[PDB]
Amino acid sequence: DKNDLKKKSDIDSSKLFNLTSYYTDITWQLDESNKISTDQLLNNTIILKDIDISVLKTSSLKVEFNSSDLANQFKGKNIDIYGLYYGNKCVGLTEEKTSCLYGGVTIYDGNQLDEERVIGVNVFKDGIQQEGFVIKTKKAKVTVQELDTKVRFKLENLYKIYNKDTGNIQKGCIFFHSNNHQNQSFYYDLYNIKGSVGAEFFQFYSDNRTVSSSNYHIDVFLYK
């Protein structure tokens, strides 16, 4: 239902400008393997050292989850991390330079595939099938954030989803469908972004929602 989707033209121009940066510059995508947390501030966070992010001049990473339960699942275990980080409003240890990411965490041990798993993305624009594409992961269990981000990056490149000076795409959504039909599909609205900075934009990923990479495919619906 197109009238349940938010409109690009209702997004403040400054916000579209900041979203464009997030989905144009690959440097915002953190992709770290076999790390381990060694500190914690709030009970729903874990802190990792020696994660060097050149563009923000930070050395530590705080991952924020929506529960103490999630943090407890991952604190002090070998983990992979994938997602979009932020530096502004990020609080770390007092004498450290820290960036922040919501969720994006998978157990490392036993989750590494012997080769890239390919996930199909079908794209429709005003109901007409467009050129499809794939995204890839090396993880058996993969965060939705990783899949969503890889798709959104490609959509920004091909369709200028978030560009402040384009207006030919006004609405859109991304659906995650189980191949075997055993899980209820779900979607995100591309133009339904919370707040005005990264600390707010990506907070919804704090659920650390995770799927089987073998069992999902993606459909994107775009509308003029």
Residue numbers in the entry: 27 to 250
What does the paper say about this structure?
Superantigens (SAgs) are the critical virulence factors of Staphylococcus aureus. SAgs can cross-bridge the major histocompatibility complex class II (MHC II) with T cell receptor (TCR) molecules to stimulate a massive proliferation of T cells (~20–30%) in a relatively nonspecific manner. The multiple X-ray structures of staphylococcal SAgs revealed that the protein is composed of an N-terminal oligonucleotide-binding (OB) fold and a C-terminal β-grasp domain. SEN belongs to the group III SAg as revealed by multiple amino acid sequence alignment.
The structure of SEN was solved by molecular replacement, and the final model was refined at 1.8 Å resolution (Rwork = 0.171, Rfree = 0.201). There is one monomer per asymmetric unit. Overall, SEN is a compact molecule and shows the classic two-domain architecture of SAg proteins. The N-terminal OB-fold domain (residues 52–137) consists of five-stranded β-barrel (β1, β2, β3, β4, β5a, and β5b) and two 310 helices (310 1 and 310 2). The C-terminal β-grasp domain of SEN consists of anti-paralleled β-strands (β6–β12) and α-helices (α4 and α5). Superposition of SEN and other SAg structures revealed that in the SEN structure, an asparagine (Asn44) is situated in a nearly identical position to that in the other SAgs. However, the aromatic pair is not present in the equivalent position in SEN. The corresponding amino acids in the position are Gly113 and Asn114. These amino acid variations might confer TRBV specificity to SEN. The ion-coordinating amino acids and their stabilizing amino acids are present in the structure of SEN.
